[PDB]
Amino acid sequence: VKWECPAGYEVKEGLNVDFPHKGMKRAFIVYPAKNVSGPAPVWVPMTGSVESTNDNLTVARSGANSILADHGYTVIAPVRACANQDPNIRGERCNGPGSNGWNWNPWFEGRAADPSGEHWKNDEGPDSSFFVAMVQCVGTKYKLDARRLFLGGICSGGTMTNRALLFRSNFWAGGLPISGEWYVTSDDGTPLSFDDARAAVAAAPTKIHQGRVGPYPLPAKVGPLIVMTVWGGEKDLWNCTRPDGSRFLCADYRPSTQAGSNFFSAQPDVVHVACSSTHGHMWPQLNTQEFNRWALDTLASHPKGSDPRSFKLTQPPEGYTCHVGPFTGLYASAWS
């Protein structure tokens, strides 16, 4: 890791605006770690399609992620590009289909189903690179632990976490993709409809599935990481909204969390923890802060480069079931 900022950019505690990156002006919020001497672990939380970055950071039901600073983590939260640097924007001009080859507008987290997404098959996108530049810049003002840079999020933020881990596995130490998409495709990269992608995983629940969320094809080997994928249970689904206001099912996180767990579990230098709950499709609701503390501290117990064989999972808060490896309680096993 290299600690550097765009020439003349002065990082500060709180809201940072007009951060220059790839022709765009970005913003992010910093909460320095509390009760920590020396380099502090980093948490980069990302909101979803409707919740504002401020909601994700300060509202209990949305995760109140800024509170992790009180837990000894320097929190660096990026604002969505669609929000035009406003940390309070919710779904306005963000909650909907993406443009310029992107599938969803909240984050540059997946290539579109049509040919315009072709280029994103092997270009991480401006969000993935922005987060790296963001952390590297904050690191010039606050002492950050280069072996403990973690990012995560819910919904589209979870999808973005998946993409970031696949394209920058040599930077991040790990992540927490909570109910994020994988956008499963055929092995040859052909985009699949929601229904077809859903059926593909159901027909082969233990295989590694390609996906529009990452590079095509997925990398044969990624850098050292610890990834904790979270599924919200039977109700972990997302209903899109048509221009006329009507709603319709457009995402099921059972296949996407399964697919992610399959890929990361197969990786030799990646410790994958699969967690299941029953809160649905939103930030973990049961013992929320207990979960945030447990999850981040679990990730921090595996600094980048650590031997996966040395990892020791501890019991999660009541309301969660987790274990190392791919998900197992989502689809019936073959031997069954």
Curated annotation (Swiss-Prot):
Its EC number is 3.7.1.7. Monomer. It comes from Pseudomonas sp. It comes from the Bacteria. SUPFAM superfamilies: alpha/beta-Hydrolases. InterPro entries: AB_hydrolase_fold, Plant_Biomass_Hydrol_Est. Keywords: Hydrolase, Signal. This is Oxidized polyvinyl alcohol hydrolase. The active site is at 155 (charge relay system), 261 (charge relay system). Belongs to the peptidase S9A family. Catalyzes the hydrolysis of 4,6-nonanedione, a beta-diketone compound. Also mediates hydrolysis of oxidized polyvinyl alcohol (PVA) in the second step in the degradation of polyvinyl alcohol. Not active toward the monoketone structure. One of its GO terms (molecular function) is beta-diketone hydrolase activity. Transmembrane segments: none annotated. It catalyses: nonane-4,6-dione + H2O = pentan-2-one + butanoate + H(+).
